[PDB]
Amino acid sequence: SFVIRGDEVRQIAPGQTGKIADYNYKLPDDFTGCVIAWNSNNLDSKVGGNYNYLYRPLQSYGFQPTNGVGYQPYRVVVLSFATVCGPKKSTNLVKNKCVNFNFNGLTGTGVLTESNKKFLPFQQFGRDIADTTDAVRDPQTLEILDITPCS
Amino acid sequence: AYTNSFTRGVYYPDKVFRSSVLHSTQDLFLPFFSNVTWFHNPVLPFNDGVYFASTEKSNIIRGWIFGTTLDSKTQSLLIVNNATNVVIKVCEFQFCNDPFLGVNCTFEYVSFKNLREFVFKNIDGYFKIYSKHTPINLVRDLPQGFSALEPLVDLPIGINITRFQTLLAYYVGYLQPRTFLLKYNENGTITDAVDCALDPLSETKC
Ligand SMILES: *[C@@H]1O[C@H](CO)[C@@H](O)[C@H](O)[C@H]1NC(C)=O
Ligand SMILES: *[C@@H]1O[C@H](CO)[C@@H](O)[C@H](O)[C@H]1NC(C)=O
Ligand SMILES: *[C@@H]1O[C@H](CO)[C@@H](O)[C@H](O)[C@H]1NC(C)=O
Ligand SMILES: *[C@@H]1O[C@H](CO)[C@@H](O)[C@H](O)[C@H]1NC(C)=O
Ligand SMILES: *[C@@H]1O[C@H](CO)[C@@H](O)[C@H](O)[C@H]1NC(C)=O
Ligand SMILES: *[C@@H]1O[C@H](CO)[C@@H](O)[C@H](O)[C@H]1NC(C)=O
């Protein structure tokens, strides 16, 4: 996270050149990630001049709300890219029907019915004698549902 | 000092419910009737997985340290329970010559009369912790019997571990890749086990 001028916002890019990309914040040529920037003229800029931001021996930027769009201060955050995964949206669960279920670790087609099994608290899936899944634990509601294959 | 590890050191290999079935699995387990080192903070290695068993009366042992150098050179695991909450940190800590308890960080989590068994293994950067608590009345050595250790903590540390030490009687075992036949009851717990590399009778049973 850094604060730069509006005209220098384009310098935060792979394979870019300029004062910021040369001496302040240099990006790799094969960098993987996203760059998000937004204007901060009503937050960081001051009427008397906000010289708290310095760039390269170093010079300050005259951030003012009465300046132009290119002279307005911009807050730029670069997210450089396993523990940080994307979110997984869940759907509603319908019982007693032939469905294509998708739980945490396995996918399959079957009929989800209420079970009478007593799973251990650390167990998520059940297995039969012939190494097939017969019951699973719902990841949201602590209940055990039998997986009957469709007719 | 060495004691006899008769039938202990068996944990759940996965999170799969099994009922009324004898399941054969291959994983790292403590050998049956093997020698485990008896202690009353020495430097001990982390070769292939370590079984830890401790007997307590006044909560002497507080935690463990896992790593390679543990001298502020690389990332090392610090799991310390300071009597109210279990604290796990993987920072490059600077440890003393003889660490003890009186009377760059990438992850941080804050949570004889008794026997506490532990299993520590690090496979593919994941630190698997299994544990089981039971009351005992015995002093000389570990009680004879069978019990299963359930998994509680899974740490995606991604840190190489070759040396561990114990922070404060306790026993240290080692895990080797042998096949086991696990007996599952109707309630899904492990009630008996057979070490397939113990004796020809166990081989026949397996
Ligand atoms: C998820 O949140 C719901 C609240 O809508 C709660 O009932 C459920 O137990 C939660 N599940 C887990 C695994 O925390
Ligand atoms: C180690 O175990 C063997 C059995 O394989 C036994 O004969 C030997 O006495 C044990 N050593 C010690 C020091 O207990
Ligand atoms: C245990 O240590 C953690 C930090 O390692 C600290 O936040 C906590 O307050 C400590 N608990 C006690 C009871 O001292
Ligand atoms: C943290 O690691 C960096 C290397 O990325 C090193 O320069 C720094 O000295 C380390 N700091 C500590 C406190 O170990
Ligand atoms: C662990 O050791 C391997 C070499 O076998 C090495 O490639 C890897 O980077 C090491 N991991 C850490 C976290 O140092
Ligand atoms: C399973 O647990 C119940 C208590 O909920 C107990 O009554 C029953 O005997 C147990 N069965 C087995 C085989 O352990």
Asked if A124 and B15 come within 8 Å (Cβ–Cβ), the reply is: yes
Q: Write down the experimental method used for this entry.
A: cryo-EM
Question: What string of DSSP letters covers A26-69?
Answer: ---TT--EEEEEEE-TTTT--TT-B---EE---EE--B-TTS-S
Spell out which residues of chain A touch residue B18, defining contact as CB-CB under 8 Å: 126-127
What is the CA angle B66-B152-A142, rounded to 5? 155
Local structure of B203: helix, strand or coil: helix
DSSP H or E segment with residue A19: helix A19-19
For chains A and B, count residue pairs whose Cβ atoms are closer than 8 Å.
Answer: 33
Local structure of A10: helix, strand or coil: helix
DSSP H or E segment with residue B88: strand B86-89
Local structure of B205: helix, strand or coil: helix
Whether B143 contacts chain A with CB within 8 A: no
Q: Which of A83, A118, A126 sits opposite B156 (nearest CB)?
A: A83
Q: Are B168 and B100 in contact (CB under 8 A)?
A: yes
Cα separation of B111 and A112, whole Å?
A: 36
Go through the domains of chain B in sequence order and give each one's CATH number.
Answer: 2-206 (2.60.120.960)
Q: Are A104 and A139 in contact (CB under 8 A)?
A: yes
Spell out which residues of chain B touch residue A119, defining contact as CB-CB under 8 Å: 17, 188
Q: Answer whether B109 contacts ligand 2 (Cβ < 6 A).
A: no
Q: Answer whether B35 contacts ligand 2 (Cβ < 6 A).
A: yes
DSSP H or E segment with residue B202: helix B200-205
Q: Are B5 and A115 in contact (CB under 8 A)?
A: no
Cα separation of A150 and B137, whole Å?
A: 54
Q: Which of A117, A122, A124 sits opposite B150 (nearest CB)?
A: A122
Nominal resolution (angstroms): 4.0
Q: Which of B152, B156, B188 sits opposite A119 (nearest CB)?
A: B188
Q: How far is the CA of B150 from the centre of ligand 6 (A)?
A: 18
Whether B188 contacts chain A with CB within 8 A: yes
Q: What is the phi/psi pair of residue B100, to 5°?
A: -160, 165
Could you say which residues from 48 to 77 on chain B have a Cβ atom under 8 Å away from some Cβ of chain A? Answer: none
Question: What string of DSSP letters covers B97-130?
Answer: SS-------S-EEE---EEEEEEEEEETTEEEEE
Q: Are B48 and B28 in contact (CB under 8 A)?
A: yes
Instruction: Give me Rg for the CA atoms of chain A.
Output: 28
**In the Cβ-directed half-sphere of B137, how many Cα atoms lie within 13 Å?**
0
Structure tokens that stand for A16 in this block? 């870019």
Q: What is the phi/psi pair of residue B97, to 5°?
A: -65, -40
Q: Are A30 and A86 in contact (CB under 8 A)?
A: no
Closest residue by Cα to residue A120 from A144, A146, A148: A144
